[PDB]
Design a protein around this ligand. Structure first.
Ligand SMILES: Cc1ccc2c(c1)SCC(=O)N2
Ligand SMILES: Cc1ccc2c(c1)SCC(=O)N2
Lengths: 546, 546
């Protein structure tokens, strides 16, 4: 019975194969068929290419050796190589054109999700070319999805030498009959078969995956669309910045490029952005996913006034100062979305661009008390229930697992009616003791939130709602301003509190506002519709924040 | 007696003043004298500029109001504004041309170093222009050097209104006679004087500083060249990455731009790069200053083999993987310098560029044992003393303050002769019990190293020297390679162990090697000659790593 799957890189996990560009070049330049492929393999196990593949020499040292082999091959074939013939140019173009074979990667992801140990076994080189970063990026993206990456140039062994196969088996800690081995080179497949491994000769991906699903008994072809890559908290880089004597802010950091600061809502975590963090980093951004003040590993002082927007915004500016960032793009959801609009209004020089999920920008009404304003909308009743210190803390902290399971539900699963909460005497008074698990979350993800909230509970988080008057007075100072930096508003069709229509007048304050809209999406945008959030945010970042 | 100094931004800490470009524009366009300056101040306290300076409106909203004022002023003066007249272009150019007034900043730094509370008090605006990042960067650099930054647009008060002066005094927690106030606008200086503050009208910097040093009694002009900005550990962003189950790596992070990974030597810390971190970040780089394995907040497993180059390099690759970085420029010193050459040889695709301070690249000799090789050079005797587990730990851990004070000394201060250490029976056997403090370090900096080493001591650090055979076998695999990625070798004239001549054959292995050389510099390069290290590294990064 199979428990391990091994994939080659060239022509398997990455296409078009770098091999076959030698063939493609021969055709375009009308060179004798196989001339370049022959110069490539010249000298066989003692040749320059084997030395390269074993890590004896680097790719830049190999280039002139390949050029000498091409000359010797053309001389024997009694032909001439063109005037501007360059091995470097040919290989630069082939490497740059080779991209991840997405359905092969998805199949490897599914097998690993089912308990398989997965590995990449590849004949590759030490890349010291000026354009090596492209291949470094491809390898980084691919490797994270596998248990092991075995590279010929690092192990000093090459396929089809029998030793690399014994080395593979030793690293997998598996007997050969327990292994599926996928390769596009028949000669490299032979020693694995000889050892008793299941082998698949990959020509076209679909046929290879049909063979792969038949032998494993796992559906790999025609599957439902997978969710984006999530985060394993223990595999993240965790950052900590003291913004003032008693306040430290924690964040998770991934990627390179323009800084993108993600600001969660209530009662959430940096982890609410788990589906966005890998996607935004892969899109070419340096992601900083915060634990907002009062949450997770960030400090949670008890005083109400520590959570007014003016103080929270000043602390986020200090956070940027201490990290040495002149700007960040700020993306927020729920309370985080309110904070990001205030960052845009009060600190535009520090905000590269601003985006909000669900939370609209509604200017303060200077002729009405914020308390009156909340009372005017029945769906805001939960905010009145949150006012009295201790009442909501008691209900939310009583049973953490029940709190998160009752809250984190898709539009067609909810049991919480945020209107008439005060009258009912609680958020969960008509909710079960043991809620069913929403299709949006796993038991493990719920337990992560439970563990995070065991540190500080709900006082700090609820305090975000307890500064209405203070926030109103501060917001009134901005009533003559417009938001003129790049801005995105993302509405969720089925958020029954932060309804899309509440955003209808935003263009009066943000004339250049761009929009996104997610159908069949509830309040928990990031986890409800992660694929669609990622598509909207990446498209907007690439056009407006780059 | 004075205890606080307050500086204006425009025309004081930053030059040329944005004011006076209105005058400069009038002259270049042959407009009536003062036309632009009049449109700028139109309506006085009720005018558009005061509204801008109080934060009522943003700079982008103010631009067309200034354009309307210019039209009204030209109409009254019976003149016409040119065809391509643009307030936006004029202000973009003026803001971009304004740079920090370095001697004014140095004077503020010296006063603060002497116990003064320093502040910037400025009439400024909320900048939402597409090019706002330039001013955001300038403000970030300046603000870090002061106790307070008071901006008119954030406080809703403007100079010369008497309220902003009372607000200044309240924030300084000082009586007016205790305050020096420097401004380039005489009208803005008047309320401070009226309150009893010492005031200086800044026209040219030299005269202003003569006035400033006369009134404070502190030398500010003609001073010795200051050291670069250092790091306060508690003000840094601290990052933590688990690279394998029992190993976490700690780093300090500052700046945006290409990742630059700094790798310290023995027995050091991320803090040994304290003078480089702010300078490299200000130069446009994202600095990652490591605590190498075995040090500070990084894990220190006891096993010797956890510290061989192959494992240390694999862990640094995993560190990059977990942070989502396809590459970093690697800069190392002493053992860190040896590691960075090995990163360049084994993982060129992950190394953007490589630089070493003091440590030369010497290929492994496959015909001589590494033990024999160390024995051949008398200055390497300390490495033999470090071999026996427990001997050097006992001597180095006996008195931490004595260890760091004996080690960290300039070339003209040393008491340690690294030849005949085994014979003498120790590194400090002819060193005092209470060494004098080197001119390179403060007591506080020594105590930081003492506190860091209290966690794990010297086992992990000494283990870096205990893998000679393992490192030799691994290095022999790279004997057919050349380092062909961008590389810099920095020699220190007076390092008597890592002598400059030991680097003489490096071009045979690194043909495109660039060099730097520091005269009158001992082993502790970064702290011995920080200004010169910063100049060499920034020049090289900007030409070879950008
Ligand atoms: C805290 C919170 C705020 C708004 C919400 C929810 C929860 S779920 C129900 C919903 O649609 N909106
Ligand atoms: C650990 C260490 C290595 C080399 C050194 C020193 C210290 S100080 C004396 C010197 O010049 N070289």
């Amino acid at each position: 019975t199979l428990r391990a799957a091994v994939f080659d890189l060239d022509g398997v996990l990455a296409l078009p194969a770098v091999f076959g560009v030698l063939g493609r070049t021969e055709e375009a330049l009308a060179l004798p068929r196989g001339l370049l492929n022959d110069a490539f393999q010249k000298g066989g196990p003692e040749g320059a290419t084997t030395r390269l593949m074993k890590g004896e020499i680097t790719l830049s040292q190999w280039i002139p050796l390949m050029e000498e082999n091409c000359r010797k091959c053309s001389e024997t074939a009694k032909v001439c190589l063109p005037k501007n013939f360059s091995i470097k140019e040919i290989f630069d173009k082939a490497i740059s054109a080779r991209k991840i074979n997405r359905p092969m990667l998805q199949a490897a992801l599914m097998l690993r999700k089912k308990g398989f140990t997965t590995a990449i076994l590849t004949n590759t080189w030490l890349d010291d070319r000026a354009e090596r970063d492209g291949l470094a990026q491809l390898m980084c993206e691919l490797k994270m999805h596998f248990d092991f990456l075995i590279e010929s140039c690092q192990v000093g062994m090459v396929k089809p030498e029998p030793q690399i196969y014994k080395f593979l088996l030793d690293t997998l800690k598996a007997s050969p009959s327990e292994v599926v081995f996928l390769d596009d080179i028949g000669a490299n497949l032979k020693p694995a078969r000889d050892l008793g491994m299941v082998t698949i000769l990959v020509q076209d991906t679909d046929t290879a995956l049909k063979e792969l699903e038949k032998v494993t008994g796992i559906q790999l072809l025609n599957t439902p669309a997978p969710l984006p890559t999530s985060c394993n908290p223990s595999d993240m880089s965790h950052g900590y910045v003291t913004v003032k004597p008693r306040v430290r802010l924690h964040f998770v950091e991934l990627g390179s490029g323009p800084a993108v600061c993600l600001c969660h809502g209530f009662p959430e975590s940096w982890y609410s952005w788990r589906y966005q963090i890998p996607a935004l980093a892969q899109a070419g951004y340096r992601v900083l996913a915060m634990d907002m003040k009062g949450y997770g590993e960030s400090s949670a002082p008890p005083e109400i006034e520590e959570y007014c927007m003016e103080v929270l915004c000043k602390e986020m500016v200090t956070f940027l100062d201490k990290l040495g960032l002149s700007q960040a793009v700020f993306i927020g959801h729920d309370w985080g979305g309110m904070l990001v609009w205030y960052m845009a209004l009060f600190y535009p020089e520090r905000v590269r661009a601003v985006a909000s999920l669900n939370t609209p920008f509604i200017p303060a009404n200077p002729n009405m008390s914020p308390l009156e304003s909340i009372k005017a909308n029945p769906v805001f009743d939960y905010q009145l229930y949150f006012q009295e210190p201790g009442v909501a803390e008691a209900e939310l902290e009583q049973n953490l697992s029940r709190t998160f399971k009752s809250l984190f539900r898709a539009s067609d699963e909810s049991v919480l009616s945020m209107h008439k909460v005060c009258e009912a005497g609680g958020l969960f008074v008509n909710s079960p003791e043991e809620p069913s698990l929403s299709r949006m979350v796993t038991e493990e993800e719920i337990q992560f939130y439970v563990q995070q909230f065991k540190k500080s509970g709900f006082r700090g988080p609820l305090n975000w709602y307890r500064n209405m008057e203070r926030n109103w007075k501060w917001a009134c100072k901005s009533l003559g301003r417009k938001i003129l930096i790049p801005a995105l508003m993302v509405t969720a069709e089925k958020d029954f509190v932060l309804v899309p229509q509440m955003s209808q007048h935003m263009e009066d304050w943000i004339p250049h506002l761009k929009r996104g809209h997610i159908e069949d999406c509830g309040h928990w945008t990031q986890m409800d519709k992660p694929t669609e959030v990622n598509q909207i945010l990446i498209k907007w970042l690439d056009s407006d924040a780059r």
